[PDB]
Design a protein around this motif. Structure first.
Motif, PDB file in Angstrom:
ATOM      1  N   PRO A   1      36.135  41.709  29.673  1.00 13.60           N
ATOM      2  CA  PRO A   1      36.927  40.728  30.437  1.00 13.60           C
ATOM      3  C   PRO A   1      38.429  40.855  30.185  1.00 13.60           C
ATOM      4  CG  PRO A   1      36.040  39.690  28.470  1.00 13.60           C
ATOM      5  CD  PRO A   1      35.428  41.087  28.533  1.00 13.60           C
ATOM      6  N   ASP A   2      38.821  41.900  29.469  1.00 14.58           N
ATOM      7  CA  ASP A   2      40.224  42.126  29.150  1.00 14.58           C
ATOM      8  C   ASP A   2      40.982  42.639  30.375  1.00 14.58           C
ATOM      9  OD1 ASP A   2      42.535  42.358  27.516  1.00 14.58           O
ATOM     10  OD2 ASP A   2      41.691  43.956  26.299  1.00 14.58           O
ATOM     11  N   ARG A   3      42.288  42.754  30.211  1.00 14.29           N
ATOM     12  CA  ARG A   3      43.214  43.332  31.176  1.00 14.29           C
ATOM     13  C   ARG A   3      42.636  44.596  31.849  1.00 14.29           C
ATOM     14  NH1 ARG A   3      47.713  46.681  30.716  1.00 14.29           N
ATOM     15  NH2 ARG A   3      47.568  47.272  28.501  1.00 14.29           N
TER      16      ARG A   3
ATOM     17  N   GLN B   1      38.261  40.489  41.326  1.00 13.16           N
ATOM     18  CA  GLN B   1      38.928  39.362  40.659  1.00 13.16           C
ATOM     19  C   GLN B   1      38.445  38.002  41.154  1.00 13.16           C
ATOM     20  OE1 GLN B   1      42.868  41.105  41.713  1.00 13.16           O
ATOM     21  NE2 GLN B   1      43.420  40.637  39.582  1.00 13.16           N
ATOM     22  N   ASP B   2      37.385  37.992  41.939  1.00 14.80           N
ATOM     23  CA  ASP B   2      36.903  36.728  42.508  1.00 14.80           C
ATOM     24  C   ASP B   2      35.986  35.986  41.529  1.00 14.80           C
ATOM     25  OD1 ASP B   2      35.116  39.121  43.586  1.00 14.80           O
ATOM     26  OD2 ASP B   2      33.861  37.334  43.364  1.00 14.80           O
TER      27      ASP B   2
ATOM     28  N   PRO C   1      42.181  48.301  42.420  1.00 13.79           N
ATOM     29  CA  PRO C   1      42.076  47.131  41.526  1.00 13.79           C
ATOM     30  C   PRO C   1      40.631  46.742  41.217  1.00 13.79           C
ATOM     31  CG  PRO C   1      42.358  46.370  43.797  1.00 13.79           C
ATOM     32  CD  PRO C   1      42.464  47.910  43.817  1.00 13.79           C
TER      33      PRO C   1
ATOM     34  N   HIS D   1      36.316  38.827  34.808  1.00 18.30           N
ATOM     35  CA  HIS D   1      36.272  37.747  33.817  1.00 18.30           C
ATOM     36  C   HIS D   1      34.851  37.250  33.612  1.00 18.30           C
ATOM     37  CE1 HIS D   1      40.818  36.896  34.490  1.00 18.30           C
ATOM     38  NE2 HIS D   1      40.644  37.653  33.420  1.00 18.30           N
TER      39      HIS D   1
ATOM     40  N   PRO E   1      48.724  46.951  35.746  1.00 17.02           N
ATOM     41  CA  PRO E   1      47.749  46.744  36.830  1.00 17.02           C
ATOM     42  C   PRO E   1      48.198  47.389  38.126  1.00 17.02           C
ATOM     43  CG  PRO E   1      48.331  44.647  35.816  1.00 17.02           C
ATOM     44  CD  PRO E   1      49.284  45.676  35.258  1.00 17.02           C
TER      45      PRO E   1
ATOM     46  N   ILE F   1      35.580  44.964  50.208  1.00 17.68           N
ATOM     47  CA  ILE F   1      35.473  45.648  51.495  1.00 17.68           C
ATOM     48  C   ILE F   1      36.811  46.028  52.130  1.00 17.68           C
ATOM     49  CG2 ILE F   1      33.211  44.701  51.976  1.00 17.68           C
ATOM     50  CD1 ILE F   1      34.566  42.737  53.896  1.00 17.68           C
ATOM     51  N   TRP F   2      37.855  45.246  51.856  1.00 16.91           N
ATOM     52  CA  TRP F   2      39.162  45.513  52.461  1.00 16.91           C
ATOM     53  C   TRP F   2      39.813  46.813  52.001  1.00 16.91           C
ATOM     54  CZ3 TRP F   2      37.636  40.920  50.266  1.00 16.91           C
ATOM     55  CH2 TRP F   2      37.314  39.895  51.178  1.00 16.91           C
ATOM     56  N   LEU F   3      39.305  47.402  50.919  1.00 14.60           N
ATOM     57  CA  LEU F   3      39.867  48.650  50.411  1.00 14.60           C
ATOM     58  C   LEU F   3      39.517  49.846  51.282  1.00 14.60           C
ATOM     59  CD1 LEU F   3      39.285  48.240  46.557  1.00 14.60           C
ATOM     60  CD2 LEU F   3      41.313  47.673  47.948  1.00 14.60           C
TER      61      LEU F   3
END
Ligand code: CA
Ligand code: CA
Ligand code: CL
Ligand code: CL
Ligand code: CL
Ligand code: CL
Ligand code: CL
Ligand code: CL
Ligand code: CL
Ligand code: CL
Ligand code: CL
Ligand code: CL
Ligand code: MG
Ligand code: MG
Lengths: 290, 549, 549
Positions: C404-406, C424-425, C421, C431, C415, C388-390
């Motif tokens: 799940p890679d880079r 990532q949570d 992005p 992942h 990155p 949401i911050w985006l």
């Protein structure tokens, strides 16, 4: 505030040359006795997100646009570690300069643990994410649900709070946090850093910036706190020698400030110091024994 | 490869486990084809010879040091044909391969032992050491004293006791039987015929037993080693034998053989006390533990070479070498809480040094500049961690971390099928520590390590040069010169965590110009006054001493 | 593709952002070639038509809804040639493509506007709406009332005010200028000539302004829409026009055009209140908010179709539709802390439902079985989260999570170069949430979603069938039949978190055999007694009603 200092230090390292730093300091006019410059390791003013420059008076004016790291971050606040690609040796070098150059330094919260930033949050908000206290939920900043944080913590493998936080750094004497705290303690015990003169020493090697700072010394002092200090900074990524003309300090004993080891006394011959890539030394110049 | 009887003196070795490096067939286990597919990485890193721990058929009860068939590759690794493919691909790149060979014992699953116990009057009846009593050889210590009640075990099929220096499922071979000596020579020849460049011979101090002795280092043991060297010399010139003798250096020199012949047993042997002494030198910020161990090491034959590595324990027995009488540091190791915590456990370099990059560089610089041929352990070049809960040995045998992808890019199998899991913690986990992430920046540990190998390879002094310790004003700094005669190098190492000055008497090289080896910067020429060098905490410098015009 | 004037009634749409799907050129930004390379995934998922948000050249100050050149692809996405490549590759797989086209306004960077302000007497002088005063049209509300002080902005170059319903950098086009109408028709034809299958026409209620009106939905606006439909009908049969009118359903029916012609404006329009009503129905465990919104929706032309989707906000304005007079739930949304927290922010399906898999399935089942053509939003099929911050829109525009890679396998770039992005949570991070991880188990959300699409595609009743709400004993359960005349399906949905029984009067289908559509199990035949179905909390069933032998 002395805004051009960080851009010049940044370029001095990119160039492996002391001159961009030598020059802005030499060209800075004297200020009233009562006054002090403020200095900080940022390339932009936080109000306007502009980097200071001057077409007529900045010899580096056109050079910033030629550096791709500089170019990529135009108009965006970045933290120290990200600006330096998380290179620990450079973080220490820039921090040493911040703490020993003339002026009163401003540290930005989180730089002491090597926090990252999140550029996508905005040009200012990039550097305004929560302080990372622990590897717990919300980096230990809050007990609220994560969706209610004003901004999220860093979560990547390099800068994320699972890896970078205060608690993790408190233990080892070798963490960036403990290193920074010790540098601040050392600085606080030597008046020449705060109010000393500034004497650039030149030297054989253009890749090394060396200077001495002195207290004028009035009434009821005499001790380490008011002794002169010698700072030597390697802007090259490679090991470098430098030979210094310190003949005016003949007989004095350089004592390295962190480990207190006595170096050979200064003579009439040039004094050789050798530094690893991006290394620096701080010495107290102790008056000899009669 | 064209024969070159000194290649091992110039080699940097890379110990790499087949099971751990790369799984090419998605069964969750590293394999020979996978190792072959990663040879470009090994070549790029700049190492000269692979050292493979045992990859023979085995029930894997003691890490594969319990061998079921000396002539067969463990099936999950591939077959002898895959091994030849690996050999040829390595040789094509100028890389050699040696392997561990356990000489003292086999698994109890070995067909020789099963015939020995089931058919005592048969041809294998005397292939092992059998007795009606458990009384023989009482002066031999029990190596695994916390696990084995005795060096003799009663076999329920043969109803006699058999001898074992290691675990009970590892019966000792009877080297007093001439057929055993011939059978083991034949094992050597089998792998040499395939083209292997040499062997580390394991557990050799224990071959023969004799009443009235502690059953180690016997003259008949050395006699058999001479047979091995002779077979090599006569039939396969240019191959190497390495001794694994976890003993004080003075005792190990015997394993190079007769000095009057220029050495007639092993070409190489390991100097085990080196890492414990370097470790204690840094803990105490004093060069003396290193100075003393080097000074007290006796001369070895000129065609021979010490092997050196950054580990505190022998991988077979998980013991750290020491000597109550000849090691002045004997009682000191127990006073160090870091040494104490890791007793009997293999740990990787980064964890041994609490992930301190400055110290990792210092220890690596010493490994690459001290006398001997160094062995790098796979993964230390990127700063891999370990997982101690997996076992005292398996701690350091987790998959190579190639990428931040699933299974660290080691395998396409499901994670639950991996032979061992990758590191997953915030410091050493594959999300942050992996080859891919370090390939880019010239400042990564991987690129730093690669550059150091390149630098070492350009100076013969590091491999075969003399060693002269320079002493100096400061006991916190270790300085020395390596020289061969035209190539002279100066190495200075700060064992203190704080910046240190050192004044060196370099008069013998007056006029010479020290050129620092990473940046090629020319330092002030050496004069008649002592030469001042200043180092940051845990720092080091390598200088080429260049002749003046 | 062969012309098929009803394809849009049978289609499942997939809204996918070019920037977000796949970066084929490692610049950190999704591109047309990348989207083309992922068409096999889209085909496998089983969707029928891509819906691309604006991909035109733009300074991207309002998400690309601020268009600088209607004839040019944003350079970082590729060129018109890459777009044709994408079109041909999709058509080859039987997939169509529609795109958003903003009709009401351009960016102030558009060359038309720069000519309008700099050269008022020139050919572009009247392309925008200019005035000496800011007094005209005072009854029009300011859409972005918290940001824009006025719908008129003073231009410092032309020194007159210009009109804008959206942000000040989005000047309104002057549709009273006949040259503007022709220029915009020409934009339509340009993309239709390239082969695009249709457009969502955006901001069309705002085209014309008139004194004495609120400047929305004017008859001249509808007249221009008729010109668009006629151009389609005459020159490109088989293409589609979709209306984005964020209005109460009764008001939206006007956008299908004249019922006496069978519809002469847009082929489709969106039913915005559906998700807010489904959301409140589940919050209250009552079928009524859904029953009522469907019952109160007026009939539309027979060749027309509603579009439906699981979002609470229009993506252009970030507003939720409502009506003080005609929405009985008007005051109720504010009483719900979940609705209240997310006011004015796009959220993905899984986060809207707190990642409750049972509810995700329930809402998806309703989307796929209620009347209309459904739109799936990219990433909802694997349960992606948002950030949401985006931003209020960028919240749901993060990279598609492939592996799940880079970079979640979206890009090979560093990155820090990604346009946005990935999550990532611990819950929604790549992942744990990604296409690769869900491909295997038949029980993943991805495979469940794919199977539901396959099932829907085999029953025309879901696409074009009638809709009969069955009522029933239990207000917590929503049951209905979809029928076309030979294909009849029964859908039962439990809005309660607890198990619920429902007795249905299915007498009209007595004798028929309900066959459950996922496992094909035959249920008891329908008789004259009420048919009992029992559902777990938030459960649903789909039954095919099969004719008896
Ligand atoms: Ca033995
Ligand atoms: Ca308008
Ligand atoms: Cl500022
Ligand atoms: Cl900045
Ligand atoms: Cl192995
Ligand atoms: Cl085999
Ligand atoms: Cl070992
Ligand atoms: Cl060890
Ligand atoms: Cl896009
Ligand atoms: Cl184009
Ligand atoms: Cl929308
Ligand atoms: Cl929404
Ligand atoms: Mg395998
Ligand atoms: Mg791209």
């Amino acid at each position: 505030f002395h805004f051009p200092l960080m851009p010049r230090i940044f370029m001095a390292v990119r160039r492996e040359s002391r001159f961009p730093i030598s020059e802005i300091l030499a060209q800075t006019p004297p200020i009233p006795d009562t006054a002090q410059w403020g200095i900080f390791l940022r390339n932009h003013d936080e109000l306007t997100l502009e980097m200071v420059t001057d077409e007529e008076r900045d010899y580096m004016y056109a050079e910033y646009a030629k550096d791709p790291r500089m170019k990529a971050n135009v108009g965006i606040r970045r933290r120290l570690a990200p600006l330096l690609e998380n290179d620990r040796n450079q973080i220490e070098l820039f921090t040493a300069l911040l703490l020993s150059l003339p002026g009163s330094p401003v540290l930005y919260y989180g730089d002491e643990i090597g926090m990252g930033d999140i550029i996508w949050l905005g040009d200012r908000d990039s550097v305004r994410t929560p302080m990372q206290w622990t590897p717990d939920r919300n980096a230990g900043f809050s007990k609220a649900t994560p969706g209610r944080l004003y901004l999220p913590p860093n979560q990547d493998a390099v800068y994320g709070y699972h890896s970078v936080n205060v608690e993790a750094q408190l233990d080892s004497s070798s963490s960036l946090l403990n290193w920074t705290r010790n540098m601040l303690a050392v600085r606080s015990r030597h008046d020449a850093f705060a109010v000393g003169t500034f004497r650039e020493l030149g030297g054989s090697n253009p890749s090394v910036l060396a200077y001495i700072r002195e207290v004028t010394r009035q009434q009821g002092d005499g001790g380490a706190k008011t002794d002169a200090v010698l700072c030597v900074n390697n802007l090259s990524r490679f090991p470098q020698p430098i030979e210094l003309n310190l003949q005016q300090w003949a007989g004095y004993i350089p004592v390295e400030m962190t480990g207190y080891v006595e170096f050979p006394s200064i003579g009439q011959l040039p004094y050789l110091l050798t530094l690893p890539g991006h290394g620096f030394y701080w010495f107290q110049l102790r008056e000899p024994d009669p | 490869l064209p024969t070159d009887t000194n290649w091992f003196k110039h080699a940097v070795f890379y110990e790499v486990l087949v099971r751990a490096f790369y799984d090419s067939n998605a069964d969750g286990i590293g394999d020979l084809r996978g190792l072959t597919e990663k040879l470009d990485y090994i070549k790029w890193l700049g190492v000269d010879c692979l050292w493979l721990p045992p990859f023979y058929d085995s029930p894997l009860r003691d890490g594969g040091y319990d061998i079921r068939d000396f002539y067969k590759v463990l099936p999950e690794f591939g077959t002898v044909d895959d091994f030849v493919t690996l050999l040829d691909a390595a040789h094509r790149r100028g890389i050699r391969i040696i392997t561990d060979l356990v000489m003292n014992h086999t698994s109890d699953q070995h067909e020789w032992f099963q015939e020995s116990r089931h058919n005592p009057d048969g041809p294998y009846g005397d292939f092992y050491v059998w007795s009606d009593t458990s009384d023989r050889y009482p002066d031999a210590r029990i190596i695994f004293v916390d696990t084995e009640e005795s060096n003799w075990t009663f076999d329920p099929v043969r109803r006699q006791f058999y001898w074992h220096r290691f675990f009970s499922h590892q019966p000792d071979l009877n080297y007093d039987n001439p057929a055993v000596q011939e059978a083991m020579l034949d094992v050597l020849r089998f792998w040499l015929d395939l083209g292997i460049d040499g062997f580390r011979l394991d557990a050799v101090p224990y071959l023969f037993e004799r009443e009235g002795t502690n059953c180690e280092n016997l003259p008949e043991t050395h006699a058999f080693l001479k047979r091995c060297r002779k077979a090599i010399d006569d039939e396969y010139p240019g191959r190497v034998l390495l001794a694994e003798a976890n003993q004080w250096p003075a005792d190990v020199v015997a394993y190079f053989g007769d000095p009057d012949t220029g050495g007639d047993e092993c070409h190489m042997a390991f100097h085990f006390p080196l890492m414990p002494r370097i470790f204690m030198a840094v803990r105490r910020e004093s060069r003396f533990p290193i100075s003393e161990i080097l000074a007290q090491t006796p001369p070895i034959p000129d065609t021979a070479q010490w092997g050196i590595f950054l580990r505190n324990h022998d991988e077979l027995t998980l013991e750290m070498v020491t000597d109550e009488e000849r090691d002045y540091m004997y009682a000191e190791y127990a006073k160090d809480p870091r040494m104490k915590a890791n007793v009997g456990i293999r740990r990787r370099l980064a964890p041994l040094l609490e992930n301190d990059r400055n110290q990792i560089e210092l220890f690596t610089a010493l490994l690459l500049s001290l006398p001997g041929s160094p062995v790098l352990y796979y993964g230390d070049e990127i700063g891999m961690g370990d997982i101690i809960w997996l076992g005292d040995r398996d701690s350091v045998r987790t998959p190579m971390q190639w990428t931040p992808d699933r299974n660290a890019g080691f395998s396409k199998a499901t994670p639950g099928r991996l032979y061992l899991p990758p590191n997953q913690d915030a410091v050493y986990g594959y999300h942050s520590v992996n080859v891919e992430a370090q390939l880019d920046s010239s400042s990564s540990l991987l690129n730093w390590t690669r550059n150091m190998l390149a630098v070492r390879s350009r100076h013969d002094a590091f491999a075969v040069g003399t060693f002269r310790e320079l002493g100096g004003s400061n006991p916190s700094v270790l300085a020395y010169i390596r020289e061969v005669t035209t190539d002279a190098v100066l190495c200075v190492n700060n064992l203190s965590r704080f910046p240190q000055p050192i004044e060196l008497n370099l008069q013998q090289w007056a006029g010479y110009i020290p050129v620092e080896m990473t940046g090629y910067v020319e330092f002030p020429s050496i004069g008649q006054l002592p030469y001042l060098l200043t180092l940051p905490g845990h720092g080091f410098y390598w200088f080429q001493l260049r002749e003046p015009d």
